[PDB]
Design a protein around this ligand. Structure first.
Ligand SMILES: O=P(O)(O)O[C@H]1[C@H](O)[C@@H](OP(=O)(O)O)[C@@H](OP(=O)(O)O)[C@@H](OP(=O)(O)O)[C@H]1O
Length: 151
């Protein structure tokens, strides 16, 4: 049930070193998807481990008894995250001029920051976009349900 999932969140966070900000068990309840993606940001191309929870996207560097597997790099409140598809073959400054396949863009609107994600396969891209949609839908459903109760 919910409580077992919270203990799992605390354990998951314990594998991320250099965590910044509020803890997962205070703001999240579930993991929709985790996976490795290529991230291109501010001219830099870097592979990152991404984790999409309800309300939060986290990305980490993979670490090269010690429980650390990931090094915290960033987090985005999904309420201030936008996503844009990128068509295969696009090559522009967002990808440093490299050709994008299986990619998309993420907008951190709280930082006015954009970056590109690329997956290795089309099916993996589709899993990510589907998970992003599902996280947003679940969050909106819960919010609108509460607002409709209050209104
Ligand atoms: O490794 P260096 O040389 O420091 O380059 C960094 C990394 O690409 C960062 O990505 P990551 O955090 O995944 O390691 C980071 O921010 P983002 O997390 O915002 O992409 C920086 O962009 P900006 O600090 O935003 O300009 C960029 O300058």
């Amino acid at each position: 049930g919910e409580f077992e999932k919270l203990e799992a969140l605390e354990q998951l966070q314990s594998h991320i070193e250099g965590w910044e900000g509020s803890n997962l068990t205070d703001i999240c309840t579930q993991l929709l998807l985790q996976g490795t993606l290529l991230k291109i940001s501010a001219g830099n191309i870097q592979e990152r481990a991404f984790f999409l929870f309800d309300n939060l996207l986290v990305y980490c560097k993979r670490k090269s008894i010690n429980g650390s597997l990931y090094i915290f790099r960033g987090r985005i409140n999904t309420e201030v995250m936008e996503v844009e598809n990128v068509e295969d073959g696009t090559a522009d400054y967002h990808s440093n001029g490299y050709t994008v396949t299986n990619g998309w863009k993420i907008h951190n609107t709280a930082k006015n920051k954009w970056f590109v994600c690329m997956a290795k396969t089309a099916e993996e891209k589709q899993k990510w976009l589907d998970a992003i949609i599902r996280e947003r839908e679940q969050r909106e459903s819960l919010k609108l349900g509460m607002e409709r109760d209050a209104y």
